[PDB]
């Protein structure tokens, strides 16, 4: 944490005086998932570059989505860019200081579970934090009690109530493909995995693999936010003897109409 | 290593001129295990803050325990506090420069082995250093030959002679519960593990999980110290679909009379 | 990357003006494998200390090997020495700027596969990057497009064509022992592994374990180099309840006549 408690306060104060919007829910939009901001009403956008203390990516968009006041991150930060986790997760603590109570995290991931198929939406039921095993953690350093406790529990990170609400909502949508669920594993990147690494990750119990999200979830739970999230399976990883960026980028627009409807409906029952 | 060889020497010299005690054994007391210092005779305490070069935690207590001259660390340092391993392990090299020959390391840990039960004492037979897999190691950097070799072996870290002496001593005590043995795995922390992570760690062959000890053992072996250690199982980790700090704190006082007797008896046969 | 693009250019320019040699192949010689430079004709050596920007180890030797113009690293750099991966891999990008098209990487490793025997040569078919799981990666930071893409694929890192050429060449040599193949796993070091760690690594699917190579391969693939490599199995790791440096050093001279012949023949078919 290269930021003082006051830095977070200064940023939150700036945002509160520049918009009349007062979000109750924050949504972090992953790779190729930034199209959700388009459905917001009474929207107000701020490029990250205009906000004091924000890291370099992207923009923050406030607005109303299906009755709920939200704030969305159009673009996120990654460890592979050279940013320490205290920079990657800066926005999460700011959201808490704005009065946000729930965080929705989304991402694009590679499918490790053999039953998954391209286009599947996997509700995140749990995660595996590989960088955390070695000490790379956003909570490393002196603990700030004004945010949370020294040793936070992480076994109940993904809200059970919201996950059931998610399944009920997916049923009302009348989708032919079942809503998937699984464990998300995060690794640093930026290179893609070798076959041997993919086999290993699957045997660790992982269903999907990506390069983000886990740090943000840990910080959100530390400061008391309710957490819900999902992965868009953009490709099936090969487990025997290639993957590119445009593949995940194309897959993004592929299931755009699907994700937008889903997230919009979930706002109805969060709750408040 | 942000410390010069001279820094270690300066600290050892300070200690040698401020107490007449000349310890042969050093004991690092973990979470809720600091009550052992109470049985020391001719004791002398120094807060870490009074000792030149010591990291910030805690106190060092010299004294006689059941016939043996000892020095105990009442409180230790952790990677999750933001300290590099060269700071976490500073005391170990100082002990070597004082003439200490044996290091006893203790800690509180979560039980991964299904047969373990709360209150069990697990002798550490081996360990798994996860942070070490990624390069986070107290020996990283130029090697100081005055302490040890460039590529130290770690497969024989936990002295076999002492482990058998430990079992014989535990038998003379007449305990109803058998003395457990197992592999300790260290992860960075400070958050507690998710269910998926717990399942993974068990399949890696780990019997107990914690956030310390391994760095100190590696440094002790590098500089030639005999090593012995154990974990107090404060709780059984859940492997299916919470843990707090006061749970391990309460469990500490729970088996206080047990640990104190055990450690005191082990001093009898170390040997000298 | 603490180096600017210009730094790489300055170093490459220095080398190009100090030798008439123009290598097409670069070979990194591992522990006890530096004897290959002896067969070079029209050789020219530069201690790393004479080359602007080079890290501290060792020497670079240019020359002709069995008809092919080569440049060899007599000694490499390791993460355990305290060097970040951007320093460890500096030479690889310089080689690309010299016009090198293929990189041959060699190392000494511990055998995890039960069928391996001391003296065996294991062709590297794939790898597992443990430090990479936690973010320690030579590509971490802003991406330099003049070298490669932001998200490079790594599943096809070890050239299939060269691996088959390797097997054909090994057959013409008339060796009694078959040429082995397997997955190489890299860990930080400098201490050697415990029994519990060895068992774990084997279950991850690793056949050989060492403290180098992976970073260099990742950087080579990022900048477009064809990659081929192998490990000299210097010892069989114990999987039940010691290893030193002179053991791998002695094993090096043991299979010197073997490795030298093999590498020399492979130059014939790389191709050009
Ligand atoms: N590590 C990894 N990432 C993958 C794979 N398939 C898709 N991804 C996505 O590729 C992207 C890079 O092309 C990664 O970042 C994004 P996000 O976490 O910002 O939403 O998700 C990741 C994959 O197979 N492995
Ligand atoms: N990582 C981890 N640590 C645990 C668990 N159960 C008990 N612990 C203990 O919780 C403590 C934090 O509440 C950790 O530090 C101490 P020590 O290593 O300083 O003796 O041991 C650790 C557990 O389930 N996981
Ligand atoms: N990590 C590890 N390294 C081993 C083992 N057996 C041999 N090695 C070699 O010991 C050497 C240290 O004695 C390591 O560095 C060299 P190189 O990567 O520079 O070629 O290879 C490594 C082994 O069992 N484990
Ligand atoms: Mg700014
Ligand atoms: Mg001080
Ligand atoms: Mg120089
Ligand atoms: Zn203004
Ligand atoms: Zn004094
Ligand atoms: Zn000159």
**List of residues 6+ apart from B39 with CB closer than 8 A:** B65, B66, B260, B264
Residues sharing a CB contact under 8 Å with residue A160, sequence separation 6 or more, in sequence order: none
Contact C225, C246 (CB under 8 A): no
Cβ pair C197:B139 closer than 8 A: no
Q: Measuring CA to CA, which residue among B33, B43, B186, B27 is closest to residue B108?
A: B33
The Cα C128–Cα C218 span in angstroms is: 11
Could you tell me whether strands B59-65 and B121-129 are parallel, antiparallel, or unpaired per DSSP bridges? unpaired
Which residues of chain A make contact with C132, given a CB cutoff of 8 A? Answer: 187-188, 191
Angstrom distance (rounded) from CA C232 to CA B90: 37
* Exposed / middle / buried, residue B94 (Cβ in 10 Å: 0-12, 13-18, 19+): buried
Nearest partner of B156 among C197, C210, C194, judged by Cα: C194
CB pairs under 8 A between B and C: 92
Mutate which of A28, A29, A31 for ligand 1 pocket (most atoms within 8 A of beta carbon): A31
- Which amino acid residue places its CA nearest to atom 6 of ligand 2? B110
CATH architecture of C1-272: 3-Layer(aba) Sandwich (3.40)
Q: What HEC string does C50-91 produce?
A: HCCCCCCCCEEEEEEECCEEEEEEECCCCHHHCCCHHHHCHH
Contacts of C153 in chain A (CB under 8 A): 191-192, 242-244
Question: Vertex C242, ends C237 and C243: CA angle to 5°?
Answer: 65
For residue B157, give the nearest of B135, B186, B188, B128 by alpha carbon: B128
Q: What angle do CA A145, B215, C209 make, to 5 degrees?
A: 120
DSSP state of B158: B
Assess contact for C91 and C83: CB atoms under 8 A: no
A160-166 contact pairs (CB < 8 A, 24+): A162/A102, A162/A226, A162/A228, A162/A266, A162/A270, A163/A123, A163/A125, A163/A228, A165/A266, A165/A269, A165/A270, A166/A123, A166/A228, A166/A230, A166/A266
Q: What are phi and psi of A235, to 5 degrees?
A: -170, 155
Q: Kindly give the pairing relationship between strand B180-186 and strand B68-74.
A: unpaired
Enter the DSSP assignment of C103. Answer: E
Token look-up 């020996």 returns B139
* Ligand 1 contact via A107 beta carbon (within 6 Å): yes
Residues of C in contact with A193 (CB under 8 A): 154-155
Does the CB atom of residue C151 touch ligand 1 within 6 A?
A: yes
Output the CA B18–ligand 8 centroid distance in Å. 6
Residue by residue, DSSP assigns B25-78 as EEEEE-TT-GGGGGG-EEEEEEEGGGSTTPPP--EEEEEEETTEEEEEEES---
**Nearest-CA distance C97 → chain A (Å):** 22
B150 contacts on C by Cβ (under 8 Å): 190, 245
Facing residue for A132 by CB, picked from B188, B195, B244: B188
CA terminus-to-terminus distance, chain B: 31
List the resolution, Å: 1.7
Token pair 């060895």 is found at C198
Way the structure was solved: X-ray
Could you tell me the distance, in angstroms and rounded to a whole number, from the CA of residue C15 to the centre of ligand 6? 14
| Residue B35 Cα to ligand 6 middle (Å) | 54
Hey, is A145 helix, strand or coil? Answer: coil
Bridge-based pairing state of the strands A41-47 and A59-65 = antiparallel
Both tokens assigned to B264? 């005191």
Measured distance CA(A124)–CA(A119) in Å, rounded: 15
CA atoms of A261 and A175, how far apart (whole Å): 11
Q: Quote the tokens at residue B162.
A: 């002492």
Interface of B with C (CB under 8 A): 125-129, 132-137, 139-143, 149-157, 183, 204-206, 218, 221-222
Named by the residue before each, gaps in chain C exceeding 2.5 A from C to N are 57, 241
Chain A hits for B196, CB-CB cut-off 8 Å, are: 126-128, 183, 205-206
Binding site members of B for phosphate: 31, 76-78, 108, 212
Ligand 1 proximity of A32 Cβ (cutoff 6 Å): no
A152: buried, middle or exposed (CB in 10 Å: 19+, 13-18, 0-12)? buried
Q: Could you write out the DSSP letters of every residue in A13-76?
A: HHHHHH-S---SEEEEE-TT-GGGGGG-EEEEEEEGGGSTTPPP--EEEEEEETTEEEEEEES-
CA–CA dist A80, A72 (Å, integer): 22
- Cβ atoms C71, C21 nearer than 8 A: yes
**Rounded CA gap, C33 and A23, in Å?**
63
Could you tell me if A74 and A207 are in contact, meaning their C-beta atoms sit under 8 angstroms apart? no
With beta carbons less than 8 A apart as the criterion, state whether B158 and B233 touch.
Answer: no
Residues of A in contact with B214 (CB under 8 A): none
Exposure of A156 by Cβ count < 10 A (0-12 exposed, 13-18 middle, 19+ buried)? middle
Chains in contact with A via at least 3 Cβ–Cβ pairs below 8 Å: B, C
SS (H, E, C) C108-173: EEEECCCCCCCCCEEEEEEEEEHHHHCCCCCCCCCCCCCCCCCCCCCCCCECHHHHHHHHHHHHHC
Task: Report d(CA A112, CA A98) in Å as an integer.
Answer: 37
Identity of the residue in B132, B154, B156 whose CB atom sits nearest the CB atom of C188: B132
Ligand 7 centroid–CA A39 distance in Å is 26
Which residue is listed with tokens 């440096």?
C245
10 Å Cβ neighbour count for B77?
24
Residue in A82, A130, A194 nearest the CB of C140: A82
Q: Decide if C142 and A82 are in contact by the 8 Å CB cutoff.
A: yes
Reduce the secondary structure of C176-225 to three states and give it as a string. Answer: CCCCEEEEEEECCCCCCCCHHHHHHHHHCCCCEEECCCHHHHHHHHHCCC
Both tokens assigned to C97? 């700027």
Angle formed by the axes of helices B160-172 and B256-266, nearest 10° = 120
d(CA C128, CA C219): 15
- How far does the centroid of ligand 1 lie from the alpha carbon of residue A259, in Å? 17
Separation CA C233–CA C61 (nearest Å) = 25
What is d(CA B115, CA B107) in angstroms, rounded to the nearest whole number? 19
CB contact under 8 A, C155 and A189: no
Retrieve residue A7's tokens: 């830095």
Cα-only R_g, chain B: 18
Euclidean distance between CA atoms A238 and A202, whole angstroms: 11
A128/B194 touch (CB, cutoff 8 Å), yes or no:
yes
Instruction: State how far residue C71 is from chain B, nearest Cα, in angstroms.
Output: 28
* CB-based contact C155 A80, cutoff 8 Å: no
Q: Which residues pair with A227 in a beta bridge?
A: A103, A158
- Comparing CB atoms, the residue among B140, B156, B221 nearest residue C82 is B140
Domain boundary assignment for chain B: 1-272
Query: Locate tokens 């006082």: which residue?
Result: B253
Q: What residue of A is the nearest CA neighbor of B80?
A: A140
Structure tokens at A118: 């391209």
| CA dist., res. B16 & res. B100, Å (int) | 12
A245/C151 touch (CB, cutoff 8 Å), yes or no: yes
Which residues lie below 8 Å from residue A103, measured CB to CB, with a gap of 6+?
A25, A26, A27, A28, A92, A95, A216, A217, A220, A225, A226, A227, A228
Q: What is the distance between the alpha carbons of residues B135 and A131, in angstroms, rounded to a whole number?
A: 12
Contact between A80 and C154 using a beta-carbon 8 Å cutoff: no
Residue (of A228, A267, A229, A250) closest to A119 by Cα position:
A250
- Chain C partners within 8 Å of B128 (Cβ): 194, 196-197, 200
Report DSSP state, residue B149.
-
Q: Which ligand is nearest to the CA of A16?
A: 7
Cβ neighbourhood burial of B3 (10 Å; 0-12, 13-18, 19+): middle
Q: How far is B153 from chain C (nearest CA, A)?
A: 5
Best of C2, C113, C132, C135 to substitute, by most chain A Cβ atoms within 10 angstroms, is C135
Measuring CA to CA, how many Å separate C217 from each of C108, C164, C186?
16, 19, 12
For residue C146, the CA-to-ligand 6 centroid distance in Å is 25
The residue contributing the CA closest to ligand 2 atom 3 is: B210
What are the φ and ψ backbone dihedral angles of C182, each rounded to 5 degrees? Answer: 180, -175
B150 C-beta neighbours (distance < 10 Å), count:
16
Contacts (Cβ under 8 Å, ≥6 apart) of A52? A10, A11, A14
Tell how far the Cα of B9 is from the centroid of ligand 7, in angstroms: 57
What the block records as the tokens of B13 is 């010299």
Cis peptide before C264 (omega within 30 of 0): no
Q: Which residues of A8-20 are buried (b: 16+ CB within 10 A; e: fewer)?
A: beebbebbeeebe
């Amino acid at each position: 944490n290269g930021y003082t408690y006051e830095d977070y306060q200064d940023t939150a104060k700036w945002l509160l005086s520049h918009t009349e919007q007062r979000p109750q829910v924050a949504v972090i939009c992953g790779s190729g998932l930034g199209g959700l901001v388009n459905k917001l009403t009474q929207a107000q956008t701020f490029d990250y570059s205009e906000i004091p203390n924000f890291p370099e990516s992207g923009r923050l968009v406030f607005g109303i989505l299906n009755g709920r006041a939200c704030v969305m991150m159009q673009g996120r930060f990654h460890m592979y860019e050279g940013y320490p986790f205290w920079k990657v997760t800066f926005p999460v603590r700011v959201f808490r200081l704005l009065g946000v109570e729930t965080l929705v995290v989304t991402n694009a991931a590679g499918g490790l579970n053999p039953n998954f198929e391209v286009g599947d939406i996997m509700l995140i039921r749990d995660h595996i934090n590989l960088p955390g095993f070695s000490g790379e953690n956003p909570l490393r350093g002196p603990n700030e009690e004004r945010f949370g406790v020294r040793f936070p529990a992480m076994s109940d990170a993904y809200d059970r109530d919201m996950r059931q609400k998610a399944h009920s909502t997916w049923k009302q949508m009348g989708e032919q493909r079942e809503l998937q669920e699984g464990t998300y594993v995060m690794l640093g990147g930026p290179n893609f995995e070798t076959v041997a690494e993919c086999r290993l990750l699957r045997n660790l119990g992982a269903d999907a693999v990506g390069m983000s999200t886990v740090p943000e979830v840990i910080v959100a739970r530390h400061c008391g936010l309710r957490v819900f999230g999902f992965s868009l399976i953009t490709n099936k990883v090969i487990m025997d003897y290639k993957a590119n960026h445009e593949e995940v980028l194309e897959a993004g627009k592929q299931a755009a109409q699907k994700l937008e409807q889903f997230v919009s409906l979930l706002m109805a029952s969060i709750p408040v």
